[PDB]
Design a protein around this nucleic acid. Structure first.
Length: 67
RNA sequence: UUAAGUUAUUAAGGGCGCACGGUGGAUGCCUUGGCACUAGAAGCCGAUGAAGGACGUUACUAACGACGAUAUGCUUUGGGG
């Protein structure tokens, strides 16, 4: 999954982060209200967010190594 | 039949033996854990925030381990199938 994230454009990342967060929020809400029935989305969504933050941090590290 | 004499039978419960049960966790067998040592590396951290902890993190969850708001884990190189 991390292949295309290297290809993304450093702000598509930022928008995808908050979109994924909204997804996670709605999933937790419709889990608290007992109609979800597909509980494995939450884990992969969290890991997607982790992927995004990792690639952003190493982008910053590359920028600082350049500077 | 009358006298005189002898001598039983009962087990309320108990004793000994035998048989059959229960309780209890010794004995034997075993090892997941320990004791003493040999050889060879190393001898230990910390303001770039330590040793130790507290709170949290799994879809469901108490304890212990792992982890830290990127949370029952993330990226990458190399093995494996």
């Amino acid at each position: 999954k991390a292949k295309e994230i290297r290809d993304l454009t450093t702000s598509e990342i930022e928008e995808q982060i908050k979109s994924s967060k909204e997804e996670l929020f709605n999933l937790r809400f419709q889990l608290a209200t007992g109609q979800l029935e597909e509980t494995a989305r939450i884990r992969t969504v969290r890991k997607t967010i982790a992927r995004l933050k990792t690639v952003a941090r190493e982008r910053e590290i590359e920028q600082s190594k350049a500077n």
